[PDB]
RNA sequence: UGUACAACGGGGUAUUGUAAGCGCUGAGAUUAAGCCUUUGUUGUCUGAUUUG
RNA sequence: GUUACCGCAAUAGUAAUUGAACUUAGUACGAGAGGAACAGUUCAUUCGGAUAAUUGGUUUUUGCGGCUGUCUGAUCAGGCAUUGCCGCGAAGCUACCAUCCGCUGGAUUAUGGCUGAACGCCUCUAAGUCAGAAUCCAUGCUAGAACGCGGUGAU
């Protein structure tokens, strides 16, 4: 059940795809085949229907959401909000982000339990994550790297970051999320590891060009297997 | 440029002519093989569409379009054409034994000075115990492989009043010529709307002469031919909220506030189509449907509007409806 | 001898950027001469030439 | 012959043209990295035909404000300053500087053959043959003989 899926042109999968325990959302790129492939592993438990960002292609790094809520920026139309209101349920509350800041998925890196906010942005998304994400809200700069939603990823059983993580930052975040970490790579050293990967409890996804040691890292830390 | 179009000089006709027809079929209903509009106005429409795999798929899109004023048209007479190893040939023109005023006006270049004695022999003589068209029409029944039908507009029902109505013919795609000929025989002294004629997502053609400019060969004023124009909206001239979309749901007359540029409003249906419809404005244009079976994922699609432009485009187009216009203006100088 | 025409005005869009003058006023001037609808007003309605 | 309208089609001209992008696809095959296509799709190259709404320009709208040398008593109003400059501009006219749109079947050559002598073996060929070209011709487009022609309307 280790998922290597090459998105033909783009090596970053999760820029067009985003998932938590409550859904599966993938963009309109290339066909319905990529869309429906998650069934024979996941199933229809977390539904999947294509949706976009105001028509623009990359849906993954747009929004901040996890199993308790979904949170959408200004840049979407009211109509894609209709769509996320049409098939997608109300038990995951989708609430709009009104501010100048577009990219939530390039900021907010969360899972079922722990969330974050970029320390540079002020309190709005911070506590509104208590309204929408409703999970633990706090801040960290990992090496002050831009896009605090870039290098990071989480799960119930751990998280994944890249080897550039310092011991202050490693042990720091390990303590934050209350589960172990393994700093690792994905897709053969994604220059941002966490922008192309998506993850949930038992599943974490990457490309056909992903190397096996990266996948023994990822699975063997989170035990994606059974 | 192309040597396709030679020689250089002007199109001798103000109304163009129809140089093709869809072949025919014997097993169909009797069908009206073509129709001619009046292009009135240019505009721009926003919408979205279903085009799987294209980069515009399920994605809101904006493009300009053309509107064409389309009066529902009235039919008088039929002529069957025999086929001969030279070309076709007519047999006899027939009519409705009552004609409107304007088609009478087609037969006089000077109407006021004339005696209006035109039809009395033909249209009067048919008043009788019958046989008037009997012999000739049954002759069409026997002979005349292909059949065409006289068609002429009502221009008193258009805001541009020249009082004079054009003539044209259109074929019939039915079969077993009896229910062809009888068809229009039933349709003598009748009109035929655009309802049963076309419907949306159908590619057709509308072409005509183009914008006479002047002499420096002579540039323009040719009837060119541009096929593949997808009708976005088949109008209805009695339809309130002319521009009512699958989205907008507000009342707007497709004729803007204060009217079109050089037009009063729209009394009859219309066709909105993408792209360009040749000519200059105020024009009478020709409509020929596909000439063949084009079927493909490209032509089988379905249009979904967002918003139609009712704004008054003289100067910069700004508001839409005078109710909303007067809510945003609020009270002017003397208003309220 | 009419939704005939033509014009004023009723009006409708829109150009225009606050007008002589005691804030008044996104008001003013123009507006088909290649914009529009004209319940009203005023006015016109048949000359010469040839052909069949 | 008159006048009118609706036609016909002798003939003559023709032109839609190049690229990658999904799918097939990391299939197919190879030691390995790669690696296509038929089409089922998508947008572009380009040429030109449309159209000038929209984005830009363009006003003898000489339509409209700031104003400036002087002429106009103040005012106003204009005038010259060769269309008075900043600014605004309908409209007209423009732009791969905007958008649309841009034919479907035959006959063929090399090629591969079927059948079968010539030649008691064969052979695509000698008779006859089945597919097939950015071609030729039709299909579609543009005109329409000013001594090419049909239909009917009036006396």
Both tokens assigned to B244? 């009512």
Are A52 and B60 within 8 A, CB to CB?
no
Sign of CA dihedral A204, A44, A73, A91: negative
Nearest nt to the B328 alpha carbon by C1': C26
Burial of residue B321, with CB atoms counted within 10 A of its CB: 0-12 exposed, 13-18 middle, 19 or more buried: middle
Q: Report the CATH number at residue B22.
A: 2.40.30.10
* Contact of A183 with A170, CB cutoff 8 Å: yes
Distance from CA of A186 to the nearest CA of B (A): 29
Q: Which residues of A153-183 are buried (b: 16+ CB within 10 A; e: fewer)?
A: bbbbebbbbbeebeeebbeebbebbebebbb
Tokens 């969360």 belong to which residue? A110
Residues 6+ apart with CB under 8 A from B42: B64, B65, B66, B67
Residues 6+ apart with CB under 8 A from B228: B203, B205
Are A28 and B60 within 8 A, CB to CB?
no
Are residue B201 and residue B165 in the same domain, yes or no?
Answer: no
Q: How many Cβ atoms from other residues are within 10 Å of residue B108's Cβ?
A: 14
Distance from CA of A125 to the nearest CA of B (A): 28
Question: What are phi and psi for residue B3, nearest 5 degrees?
Answer: -90, 5
Listing DSSP states for A46-111 in one string gives S-B----BTTBS--TTT-EEETTEEEE-SSS-HHHHHHHHHTS-SSSEEEE--SS---STTT----
Instruction: Pick from A35, A53, A55 the residue to mutate for testing the B interface (most B CBs within 10 Å).
Output: A55
What's the N-to-C CA distance of chain A in angstroms? 9
- Which residues precede gaps in chain B, with C-N > 2.5 A? 216
Asked, for residue B215, whether it belongs to a domain, the answer is: no
Both tokens assigned to B183? 């068809």
For residues B149 and B141, give the distance between their C-alpha atoms in angstroms, rounded to a whole number.
Answer: 14
* Contact of B190 with B74, CB cutoff 8 Å: yes
- Among B278, B158, B210, which residue's Cα sits nearest to residue B13? B210
Are residue B316 and residue B201 in the same domain, yes or no?
Answer: yes
DSSP-derived 3-state class of residue B52: coil
Beta strands in chain B (DSSP E): 34-49, 61-70, 73-83, 88-90, 146-152, 167-171, 190-192, 203-207, 229-234, 269-274, 283-288, 303-308
Rg of chain A taking only CA atoms, in angstroms: 16
Burial of residue B60, with CB atoms counted within 10 A of its CB: 0-12 exposed, 13-18 middle, 19 or more buried: middle
For residues B21 and B79, give the distance between their C-alpha atoms in angstroms, rounded to a whole number.
Answer: 16
Bin B126: left if φ > 0, else alpha if -120 < ψ < 50, else beta: alpha
Beta bridge partners of B50: none
Beta bridge partners of B151: B75, B168
- Among A158, A172, A171, which residue's Cα sits nearest to residue A202? A158
Q: Say whether the peptide bond before residue B7 is cis (omega within 30 degrees of 0).
A: yes
- Give CA separation, B157 vs A176, B102, B183, B269, in Å: 78, 11, 26, 11
For residues A203 and A5, give the distance between their C-alpha atoms in angstroms, rounded to a whole number.
Answer: 13
Q: How far is the CA of B7 from the C1' of D79 (A)?
A: 54
Both tokens assigned to A58? 């990359």
Q: Which residues of B18-35 are buried (b: 16+ CB within 10 A; e: fewer)?
A: beebbebeeeeebbbbbb
**Crossing angle for the helix pair B134-142 and B178-187, nearest 10 degrees?**
150
For residues B82 and B88, give the distance between their C-alpha atoms in angstroms, rounded to a whole number.
Answer: 6
Are residue B96 and residue B13 in the same domain, yes or no?
Answer: no
Beta bridge partners of B90: B81
Asked, for residue B275, whether it belongs to a domain, the answer is: yes
B280 touches strand D (CB under 7 A): yes
For residues A205 and A218, give the distance between their C-alpha atoms in angstroms, rounded to a whole number.
Answer: 9
Q: How many Cβ atoms from other residues are within 10 Å of residue A141's Cβ?
A: 12
> Hey, what's the torsion of the CAs at A152, A155, A160, A161, to 10 degrees?
20
Asked, for residue B319, whether it belongs to a domain, the answer is: yes
Asked, for residue B115, whether it belongs to a domain, the answer is: yes
* Contact of B301 with B201, CB cutoff 8 Å: yes
For residues B19 and B262, give the distance between their C-alpha atoms in angstroms, rounded to a whole number.
Answer: 31
What is the strand order of the sheet A153-154 is part of? A153-154, A159-161, A181-183
Are A52 and B59 within 8 A, CB to CB?
yes
Question: What are phi and psi for residue B290, nearest 5 degrees?
Answer: 65, -25
Which residues span the domain enclosing B336? 1-71+193-210+220-336
Are residue B127 and residue B89 in the same domain, yes or no?
Answer: yes
Are residue B203 and residue B307 in the same domain, yes or no?
Answer: yes
Asked, for residue B78, whether it belongs to a domain, the answer is: yes
Q: Which residues of B270-293 are buried (b: 16+ CB within 10 A; e: fewer)?
A: bbbbbeebbbeeebbbbbbbeeee
Residue A55 with chain B: CB contacts under 8 Å = 58-60
Long-range interactions of B325-332: CB distance < 8 A, separation 24+: B325/B257
Domain boundaries, chain A: 1-226
Are residue B248 and residue B329 in the same domain, yes or no?
Answer: yes
Distance from CA of A106 to the nearest CA of B (A): 24
CA angle A119, A122, A128 (to 5 degrees): 100
Are residue B202 and residue B117 in the same domain, yes or no?
Answer: no
- Give CA separation, B159 vs A31, A50, B238, B255, B320, in Å: 50, 48, 15, 12, 22
Both tokens assigned to B329? 């203006």
Question: What are phi and psi for residue A60, nearest 5 degrees?
Answer: -75, -45
Q: How far is the CA of A48 from the C1' of D80 (A)?
A: 78
Both tokens assigned to A93? 């509350």
Rg of chain B taking only CA atoms, in angstroms: 23
For residues A200 and A46, give the distance between their C-alpha atoms in angstroms, rounded to a whole number.
Answer: 11
Q: How many Cβ atoms from other residues are within 10 Å of residue B53's Cβ?
A: 10
For residues B60 and B37, give the distance between their C-alpha atoms in angstroms, rounded to a whole number.
Answer: 30
The total number of residues written for chain A in this structure: 226
Quote the number of domains for chain B.
Answer: 2
Residues packed against strand C, CB within 7 Å: B 112-113, 156-157, 159, 161, 256-265, 280-281, 312, 314-316, 318-319, 322, 325, 329-333
Residues 6+ apart with CB under 8 A from A66: A20, A21, A22, A110, A111, A112, A115, A133, A135
What's domain A1-226's architecture?
A: 5-stranded Propeller (3.75)
Question: Determination method here?
Answer: cryo-EM
Residues 6+ apart with CB under 8 A from B87: none
Are A28 and B58 within 8 A, CB to CB?
yes
The total number of residues written for chain B in this structure: 336
**CA of residue B302 relative to chain centroid, distance:** 22
Are residue B203 and residue B185 in the same domain, yes or no?
Answer: no
Sign of CA dihedral A52, A55, A58, A64: negative
Tell me the structure's resolution in angstroms, rounded to a single decimal.
3.7
HSE-CB for A158 with a 13 A CA cutoff: 20
Are B58 and A77 within 8 A, CB to CB?
no
Are residue B129 and residue B157 in the same domain, yes or no?
Answer: yes
Are residue B197 and residue B326 in the same domain, yes or no?
Answer: yes
Are A77 and B60 within 8 A, CB to CB?
yes
Q: Report the CATH number at residue B186.
A: 3.30.1430.10
Q: How many Cβ atoms from other residues are within 10 Å of residue B110's Cβ?
A: 6
DSSP assignment letter at B301? -
Question: What are phi and psi for residue A193, nearest 5 degrees?
Answer: -65, -40
HEC-encoded secondary structure of B95-141: CCCCCCHHHHHCCCCCCCCCCCCCCHHHHHHCCCCCCCCHHHHHHHH
């Amino acid at each position: 059940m280790a998922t290597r899926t090459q998105f033909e042109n783009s090596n970053e999968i999760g820029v067009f795809s985003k998932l938590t325990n409550t859904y599966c959302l993938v963009a309109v790129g290339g066909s319905e085949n990529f869309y429906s492939a998650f069934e024979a592993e996941l199933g229809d438990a977390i539904p999947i229907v294509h949706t976009t960002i105001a028509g623009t292609r990359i849906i993954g790094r747009m929004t901040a959401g996890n199993r308790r809520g979904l949170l959408v920026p200004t840049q979407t139309t009211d109509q894609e909000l209709q769509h996320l209101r049409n098939s997608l349920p109300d038990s995951v509350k989708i609430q709009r982000v009104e501010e100048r800041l577009s990219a939530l998925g390039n900021v907010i890196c969360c899972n079922d339990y722990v969330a974050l906010v970029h320390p540079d942005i002020d309190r709005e998304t911070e506590e509104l994550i208590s309204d929408v994400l409703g999970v633990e809200v706090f801040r960290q700069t990992i090496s002050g790297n831009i896009l605090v939603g870039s290098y990071c990823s989480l799960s119930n059983q751990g998280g994944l970051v890249h080897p550039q993580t310092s011991v202050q930052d490693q042990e720091e975040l390990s303590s934050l999320l209350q589960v172990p970490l393994v700093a690792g790579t994905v897709n053969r050293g994604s220059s941002v590891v966490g922008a192309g990967m998506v993850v949930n409890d038992y599943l974490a996804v990457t490309g056909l060009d992903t190397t096996a040691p990266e996948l023994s890292v990822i699975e063997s830390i989170f035990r994606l297997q059974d | 440029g192309h040597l396709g179009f030679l020689p250089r000089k002007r199109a001798a006709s103000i109304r163009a002519r129809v140089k093709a027809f869809p072949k025919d079929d014997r097993s169909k209903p009797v069908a009206l093989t073509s129709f001619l509009g009046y292009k009135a106005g240019m505009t721009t429409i926003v919408r979205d569409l279903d085009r799987p795999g294209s980069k515009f798929h399920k994605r809101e899109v904006v493009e300009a379009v053309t509107v064409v004023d389309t009066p529902p048209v009235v039919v008088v007479g039929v002529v069957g054409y025999v086929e001969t190893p030279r070309g076709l040939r007519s047999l006899t023109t027939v009519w409705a034994e009552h004609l409107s005023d304007e088609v009478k006006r087609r037969f006089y270049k000077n109407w006021y000075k004339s005696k209006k004695k035109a039809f009395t022999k033909y249209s009067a003589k048919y008043a009788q115990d019958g046989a008037g068209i009997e012999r000739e029409l049954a002759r069409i029944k026997k002979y005349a492989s292909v059949v065409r039908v006289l068609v002429h507009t009502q221009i008193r029902k258009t805001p541009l009043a020249q009082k004079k109505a054009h003539l044209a013919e259109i074929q019939l795609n039915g079969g077993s010529i009896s229910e062809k000929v009888d068809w229009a025989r039933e349709h003598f002294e009748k009109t035929v709307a655009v309802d049963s004629v076309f419907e949306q997502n159908e590619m057709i053609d509308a072409i005509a002469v183009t914008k006479g400019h002047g002499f420096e060969g002579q540039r323009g004023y040719h009837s060119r031919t541009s096929i593949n124009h997808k009708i976005y909206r088949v109008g209805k001239g009695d339809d309130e909220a002319n521009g009512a979309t699958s989205f907008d749901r507000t009342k707007k007359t497709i004729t803007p506030m204060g009217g079109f540029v050089h037009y009063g409003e729209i009394k009859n249906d219309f066709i909105m189509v993408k792209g360009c419809i040749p000519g200059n404005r105020k024009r009478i244009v020709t409509l020929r449907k596909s000439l063949y079976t084009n079927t493909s994922r490209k032509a089988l699609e379905e249009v979904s509007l967002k918003w139609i432009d009712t704004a008054s485009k003289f100067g910069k187009g700004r508001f839409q409806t005078p109710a909303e216009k007067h809510a945003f203006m609020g009270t002017l100088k003397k208003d309220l």
